[PDB]
């Protein structure tokens, strides 16, 4: 199972394989964040710490904050 990282809006692409009993905070906790400094999205939906992941999640992890 392979996980891409990138930061918000950093343009960060890497394809990756995939396992089975992973989930989205594991790659997260496994760049040392799970999640803390941004909100978990993937496929452009927005998901928990503890929510799963699959199709090969990337890893966000950076200030993905915003005021607009």
């Given at each position: 199972?392979?996980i891409?990282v990138?930061v918000?809006?950093?343009?960060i692409?890497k ?42 999640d ?5 200030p ?5």
């Amino acid at each position: 199972k392979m996980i891409k990282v990138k930061v918000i809006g950093r343009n960060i692409e890497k394809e990756i394989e995939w396992r089975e009993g992973m989930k989205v905070r594991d790659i997260l906790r496994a760049v040392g964040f799970n999640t803390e400094s941004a909100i978990a999205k993937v496929n452009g939906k927005v998901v928990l710490e503890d929510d799963e992941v699959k199709d090969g999640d990337f890893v966000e992890v950076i200030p993905v904050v915003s005021g607009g």
